[PDB]
Design an enzyme around this catalytic site. Structure first.
Site, mmCIF file in Angstrom:
data_model
loop_
_atom_site.group_PDB
_atom_site.id
_atom_site.type_symbol
_atom_site.label_atom_id
_atom_site.label_comp_id
_atom_site.label_asym_id
_atom_site.label_seq_id
_atom_site.Cartn_x
_atom_site.Cartn_y
_atom_site.Cartn_z
ATOM 1 N N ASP A 142 0.626 -1.224 -0.161
ATOM 2 C CA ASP A 142 0.034 0.091 -0.097
ATOM 3 C C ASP A 142 0.825 1.356 0.039
ATOM 4 O OD1 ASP A 142 -1.860 1.887 0.276
ATOM 5 O OD2 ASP A 142 -2.998 0.962 2.098
ATOM 6 N N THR A 143 0.914 1.850 -1.319
ATOM 7 C CA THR A 143 2.033 3.062 -1.292
ATOM 8 C C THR A 143 1.229 4.257 -0.596
ATOM 9 O OG1 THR A 143 0.849 3.521 -3.433
ATOM 10 C CG2 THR A 143 3.076 2.308 -3.342
ATOM 11 N N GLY A 144 -0.289 4.103 -0.295
ATOM 12 C CA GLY A 144 -0.813 5.313 0.370
ATOM 13 C C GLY A 144 -0.644 5.125 1.872
#
Ligand SMILES: COc1ccc(S(=O)(=O)N(CC(C)C)C[C@@H](O)[C@H](Cc2ccccc2)NC(=O)O[C@H]2CO[C@H]3O[C@@H]4OCC[C@@H]4[C@H]32)cc1
EC number: 3.4.23.16
Lengths: 99, 99
Positions: free
Chosen positions: A25-27
């Site tokens: 999850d880059t967010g």
């Protein structure tokens, strides 16, 4: 590997002697795992996203193996609906977003 | 480009002729943007994140530029804490995760 994004980028992780499925999850600034036991001390934290905040336990210096790659860092444990591998560990496995 | 994850993967988007900042988010299925006005009819959606659910307005076939890349697709508008570019548009700009 190269992971496309047509479906959720789920991988297998090993943490605390357990296998789990988790989302790359880059967010997510932080790594957040569903309820489990971890060794060492912890401290409370509130983390928030869509829908608000949840209370978690913060454990530092936890070793995780993510799709075969080892990393160490902080892991937050609490009532997350999805195990998420956040940037604090994505960096350590050398993950980048490319387009 | 190649975007590392030591800092948040924030980029400039253009929607409605306006520039905004948004987070490239591989952990998001959908794109969710803070309250703004978009043209046409909308449909209801409930989306679920870490701290529960929010109600949003679904607009389809919206022209949006993401870091200079043009996309046309679904945008959800609602009380998100930050503008999120999710996989529905990350796939349009050809984004992959690599490690
Ligand atoms: C179906 O379509 C969707 C459904 C859900 C979501 S989401 O925003 O709830 N989320 C889904 C994921 C939890 C399974 C996308 C995530 O990438 C969000 C995206 C997000 C970012 C910021 C705020 C709200 C959401 N990140 C997030 O909750 O991060 C947590 C963990 O680390 C902290 O860093 C973040 O920044 C500080 C707070 C959050 C904390 C988006 C589109």
């Amino acid at each position: 590997p190269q992971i496309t994004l047509w479906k959720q980028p789920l991988v297998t992780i090993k943490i605390g002697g357990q296998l789990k499925e988790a989302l790359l999850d880059t967010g997510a600034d932080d790594t957040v795992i569903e309820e489990m036991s971890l060794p060492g001390r912890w401290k409370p934290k509130m983390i928030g996203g869509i829908g608000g905040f949840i209370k978690v336990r913060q454990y530092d210096q936890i070793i995780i193996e993510i799709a075969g790659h080892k990393a160490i860092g902080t892991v937050l444990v609490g009532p997350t609906p999805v195990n998420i591998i956040g940037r604090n560990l994505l960096t350590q496995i050398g993950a980048t977003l490319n387009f």
